[PDB]
Curated annotation (Swiss-Prot), chain A:
Coiled coil regions, renumbered to chain: none
Family statement: Belongs to the PsbB/PsbC family. PsbB subfamily.
Protein name in UniProt: Photosystem II CP47 reaction center protein
Subunit structure: PSII is composed of 1 copy each of membrane proteins PsbA, PsbB, PsbC, PsbD, PsbE, PsbF, PsbH, PsbI, PsbJ, PsbK, PsbL, PsbM, PsbT, PsbX, PsbY, PsbZ, Psb30/Ycf12, at least 3 peripheral proteins of the oxygen-evolving complex and a large number of cofactors. It forms dimeric complexes.
Compartment(s) where it occurs, according to its Swiss-Prot or TrEMBL record: Plastid, Chloroplast thylakoid membrane
Species per Swiss-Prot/TrEMBL record: Chlamydomonas reinhardtii
């Protein structure tokens, strides 16, 4: 029965699943990048750069 | 094409290519300014091509000076006022007195701005009187009404611009006159709800004396 703070220790010894969670982390970071870019475009005002 | 080169075609050949939205191109007739006799002539097919629609963007990005901005057309090939006529005197030294009374003198077109903003405007040369000598044939026209007074607003309720001609090529025999054209007119307003915008139109033209 694992504690809650060591539940990612089941992929110490499973390298394909390690690559899977590397990929999922990369996808989440890129998703933040795209969503923050679109939100910042929609908020942004180019009306006077002076 | 020229005028007879256009009228040699049939309607099945004109239909579907955009040749109909053109002035007929005039041949070599440059600088024939002494080859102009007098008379109270009329015009046969006074057509005017536009080639660039620029809008005075009133928004500032540099200082208190605003230029004209090249834009895109929006509807389709919906320009080149056709079949205009009236009364067209040629005087002594080249004083043209050109009076427009009839014909399709109006065309309503829409045009963006970079920034994603649409502006509708008329292109009207209704009732123009140009009395000048072959360089700045000046005078004013009417911008009658962008929409009729019987127009329904979406919830069921409810001027003069500048125009400068020029003359470049003159056919001495048949009187075919080409030239360049400029104009500045206001935009549409929805009756004071939106302030108007200045619009410059440049182009060419064509006419046949008779
Ligand atoms: C590069 C970053 C990184 C990586 C890959 C790891 C990886 C790991 N850590 Mg770890 N750790 C890190 C940074 C990192 N750590 C930091 C900075 C600290 C100090 C705060 C710790 C403190 C720490 C402890 C004390 C322990 C681990 C443990 C572990 C292992 C299992 C994790 C687990 O199941 O916990 C699962 C944990 C959770 C499900 C809790 C997540 C809830 C968080 C707090 C809120 C959400 C955060 C939110 C999304 C914002 C984060 C985004 C960004 C700002 C980072 C695993 C190998 C465990 C270990 O050694 O194995 C026995 C362990 O006991 N880590
Ligand atoms: C020469 C072969 C090769 C190449 C090119 C890579 C490249 C990479 N490895 Mg990798 N690796 C290799 C051999 C290789 N490794 C070997 C021999 C092993 C041991 C068996 C591993 C074990 C390993 C682990 C355990 C992990 C990596 C990870 C990564 C990535 C880290 C950076 C990243 O995510 O960029 C971001 C990536 C992109 C922006 C995508 C760019 C496009 C790429 C090239 C893929 C395009 C499709 C491609 C043809 C599919 C095959 C992928 C790969 C096998 C070539 C990176 C793409 C980490 C990972 O999974 O990252 C997610 C990770 O945790 N590697
Ligand atoms: C430099 C780049 C970098 C690094 C090294 C990390 C590192 C980490 N990220 Mg991460 N992330 C990044 C950039 C980065 N991030 C970016 C740019 C984004 C997009 C916004 C994310 C979005 C993201 C998500 C959505 C998730 C992670 C998670 C994780 C953790 C996975 C390891 C783990 O489970 O161990 C165990 C990790 C810990 C015990 C974390 C302790 C350290 C953190 C920093 C605690 C501080 C948080 C703070 C108290 C506020 C709480 C947040 C809460 C209110 C939401 C690890 C700490 C995952 C996670 O939380 O792990 C389950 C997760 O789900 N990240
Ligand atoms: C296809 C590849 C690709 C490309 C071309 C881009 C391009 C871009 N990304 Mg991006 N991104 C990608 C993949 C890609 N990304 C992936 C896979 C992720 C997920 C991890 C992200 C996550 C991401 C985020 C979260 C953000 C961007 C942003 C950006 C933009 C600005 C980049 C910037 O300032 O970073 C500057 C980059 C650096 C300073 C690089 C730091 C790397 C350090 C220095 C490496 C140090 C260690 C290294 C191993 C060196 C040791 C070896 C040594 C011997 C040489 C740019 C358009 C930003 C943006 O505009 O917002 C949307 C932004 O915020 N990206
Ligand atoms: C599948 C697919 C698709 C779709 C995609 C998508 C749409 C995705 C998603 C995307 C997204 C949309 C993502 C998202 C992202 C975001 C995130 C991931 C976030 C994060 C955050 C964080 C992490 C934070 C934390 C915290 C708080 C809460 C606040 C403060 C700060 C802190 C740090 C504390 C496509 C189309 C391509 C097609 C193909 C298929």
């Amino acid at each position: 029965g694992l504690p809650w703070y060591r539940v990612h220790t089941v992929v110490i010894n499973d390298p394909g699943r390690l690559i899977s969670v590397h990929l999922m982390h990369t996808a989440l970071v890129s998703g933040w990048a795209g969503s923050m870019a679109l939100f910042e475009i929609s908020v942004f005002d180019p009306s006077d750069p002076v | 094409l020229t005028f007879d080169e256009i009228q040699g075609l049939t309607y099945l050949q004109v239909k579907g290519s955009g040749i109909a939205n053109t002035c007929p191109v005039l041949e070599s007739g440059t600088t024939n300014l002494k080859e102009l006799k007098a008379g109270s002539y009329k015009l046969e097919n006074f057509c005017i091509e536009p080639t660039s629609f620029t809008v005075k963007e009133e928004s500032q990005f540099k200082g208190g000076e605003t230029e004209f901005v090249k834009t895109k057309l929006m509807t389709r090939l919906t320009y080149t006022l056709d079949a205009m006529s009236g009364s067209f005197k040629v005087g002594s030294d080249g004083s043209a007195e050109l009076k427009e009374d009839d014909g399709i003198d109006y065309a309503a077109t829409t045009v963006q701005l970079p920034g994603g903003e649409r502006v509708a405007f008329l292109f009207t040369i209704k009732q123009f009187d140009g009395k000048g000598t072959l360089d700045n044939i000046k005078g004013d026209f009417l911008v009658p009404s962008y929409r009729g007074s019987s127009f329904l607003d979406p919830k069921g309720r409810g001027l003069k611009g500048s125009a400068v001609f020029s003359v470049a090529k003159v056919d001495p025999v048949t009187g075919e006159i080409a030239g360049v054209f400029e104009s500045i007119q206001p935009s549409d307003t929805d009756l004071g709800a939106k302030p108007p915008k200045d619009i410059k139109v440049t182009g060419l033209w064509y006419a046949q004396l008779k």
